[PDB]
Amino acid sequence: PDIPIQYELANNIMENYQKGLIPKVRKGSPINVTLSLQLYQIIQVNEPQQYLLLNAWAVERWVDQMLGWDPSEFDNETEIMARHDDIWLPDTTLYNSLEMDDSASKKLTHVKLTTLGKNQGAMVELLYPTIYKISCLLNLKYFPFDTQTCRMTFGSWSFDNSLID
Amino acid sequence: PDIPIQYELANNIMENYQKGLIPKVRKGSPINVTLSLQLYQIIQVNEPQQYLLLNAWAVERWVDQMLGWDPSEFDNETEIMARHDDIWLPDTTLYNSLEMDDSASKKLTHVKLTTLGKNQGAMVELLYPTIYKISCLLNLKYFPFDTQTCRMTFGSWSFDNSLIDYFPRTFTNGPIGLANFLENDAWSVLGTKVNREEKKYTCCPVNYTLLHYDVVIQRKPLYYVLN
Numbered sequence: 001p002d003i004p005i006q007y008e009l010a011n012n013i014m015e016n017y018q019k020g021l022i023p024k025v026r027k028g029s030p031i032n033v034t035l036s037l038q039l040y041q042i043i044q045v046n047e048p049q050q051y052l053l054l055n056a057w058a059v060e061r062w063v064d065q066m067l068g069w070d071p072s073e074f075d076n077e078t079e080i081m082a083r084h085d086d087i088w089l090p091d092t093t094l095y096n097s098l099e100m101d102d103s104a105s106k107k108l109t110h111v112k113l114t115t116l117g118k119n120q121g122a123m124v125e126l127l128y129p130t131i132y133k134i135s136c137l138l139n140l141k142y143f144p145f146d147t148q149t150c151r152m153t154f155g156s157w158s159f160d161n162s163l164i165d
Numbered sequence: 166p167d168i169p170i171q172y173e174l175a176n177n178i179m180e181n182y183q184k185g186l187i188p189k190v191r192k193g194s195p196i197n198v199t200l201s202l203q204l205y206q207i208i209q210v211n212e213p214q215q216y217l218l219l220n221a222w223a224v225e226r227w228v229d230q231m232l233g234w235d236p237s238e239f240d241n242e243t244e245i246m247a248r249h250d251d252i253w254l255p256d257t258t259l260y261n262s263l264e265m266d267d268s269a270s271k272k273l274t275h276v277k278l279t280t281l282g283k284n285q286g287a288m289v290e291l292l293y294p295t296i297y298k299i300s301c302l303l304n305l306k307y308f309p310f311d312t313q314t315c316r317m318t319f320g321s322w323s324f325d326n327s328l329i330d331y332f333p334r335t336f337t338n339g340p341i342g343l344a345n346f347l348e349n350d351a352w353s354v355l356g357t358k359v360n361r362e363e364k365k366y367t368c369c370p371v372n373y374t375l376l377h378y379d380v381v382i383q384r385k386p387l388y389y390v391l392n
């Protein structure tokens with residue numbers, strides 16, 4: 001009554017959660033993660049050290065099978081915002097990266113949860129800006145009329161596709 | 166039933182564990198650690214400051230004698246993933262390193278545990294990328310036709326070989342993997358070597374193990390000759 005409904009909703013959905021382990025309740029299927037990228041700037045191209053610096057926005061979407069709730073029980077609420085430290089997140093990694101510290105190349109603040117049912121889980125969306133230091137081989141044979149192609153590789157560092165896809 | 170089996174498995178295996186101390190249950194033998202390295206890039210060679218910058222991947226394997234479980238009790242599960250902060254890890258150190266902060270030269274995320282039995286422990290594997298700042302002496306007498314050799318020394322900073330032992334793991338083409346190496350525009354790699362040595366403390370009658378990795382690089386003088 002005199003407290004936000006978000007307090008009760010978070011207390012209800014955060015009761016039995018353990019963020020240190022993957023929330024896989026169904027044995028048959030893995031967890032599907034969808035990734036999209038938007039390019040905003042090309043900061044620097046370094047030929048002697050063979051790396052490329054980019055500024056981009058990344059969006060990841062997946063379904064958490066342990067964070068579902070019934071909207072009718074909570075004043076018909078179908079959305080909530082939680083800190084990224086509270087819930088489990090997939091380990092999306094750039095394989096050919098020249099930066100070892102994630103605090104200088106990423107910024108995670110919040111995630112959005114949309115319920116799918118009491119026993120169906122919730123949809124999790126994570127959007128954050130990032131700066132990528134990508135190491136790519138450069139061919140300077142036709143300088144200054146040269147064109148370059150650098151590849152970005154994304155995936156899971158420790159989980160096989162039977163767990164995260 | 167309505168919770169992941171990983172929850173129960175982690176709660177079972179994490180009950181009596183203390184990550185701040187070495188998990189040595191058997192008195193007779195030490196803990197063996199196997200290390201392998203793969204080279205990906207040569208970022209910079211600095212002659213005035215006498216250091217070399219490399220980008221490499223490191224894999225370490227050992228057996229933890231306190232993290233065993235019976236697969237049949239947990240829905241026939243034989244593997245699990247845990248954060249590196251939860252369990253004990255050996256202190257593998259590069260002796261001739263010019264970097265004091267490990268957050269800018271290493272990135273540890275997760276470890277993989279494979280059970281060997283309820284009372285036999287589990288096999289732990291740790292893979293992570295790293296950037297090494299190696300200080301090596303450079304001889305510029307034959308510049309620009311010079312070749313250099315810098316050594317990498319690995320071992321335990323505080324534990325003698327009666328507690329932690331180190332062994333090298335080599336690849337098909339040599340001790341250091343070069344199948345995914347990125348070609349440098351100024352240096353070429355000729356070969357690699359590995360050597361395992363036991364060294365004596367100069368205050369105590371105990372030994373410790375050191376691993377020596379040798380990399381031979383040769384300069385390309387075409388730019389200087391033509392310029």
Ligand SMILES: *[C@@H]1O[C@H](CO)[C@@H](O[C@@H]2O[C@H](CO)[C@@H](O)[C@H](O)[C@H]2NC(C)=O)[C@H](O)[C@H]1NC(C)=O
Nearest residue numbers: 326327362363364365366369370371372373374
């Ligand atoms: C510690 O390392 C030294 C390395 O010298 C070992 O010394 C060897 O000892 C054996 C006999 O135990 C000799 O046959 C070898 O010739 C010695 N090595 C050399 C290079 O001379 C020593 O055994 C190791 N273990 C200890 C001291 O407990």
Ligand SMILES: *[C@@H]1O[C@H](CO)[C@@H](O)[C@H](O)[C@H]1NC(C)=O
Nearest residue numbers: 070071072073074075076077
């Ligand atoms: C949503 O739930 C609230 C419960 O507080 C109820 O008063 C309201 O009528 C519901 N609206 C709809 C459209 O179901």
Ligand SMILES: *[C@@H]1O[C@H](CO)[C@@H](O)[C@H](O)[C@H]1NC(C)=O
Nearest residue numbers: 235236237238239240241242
């Ligand atoms: C593995 O253990 C499970 C226990 O849930 C059992 O149902 C299954 O038959 C076992 N399979 C084998 C091959 O032992």
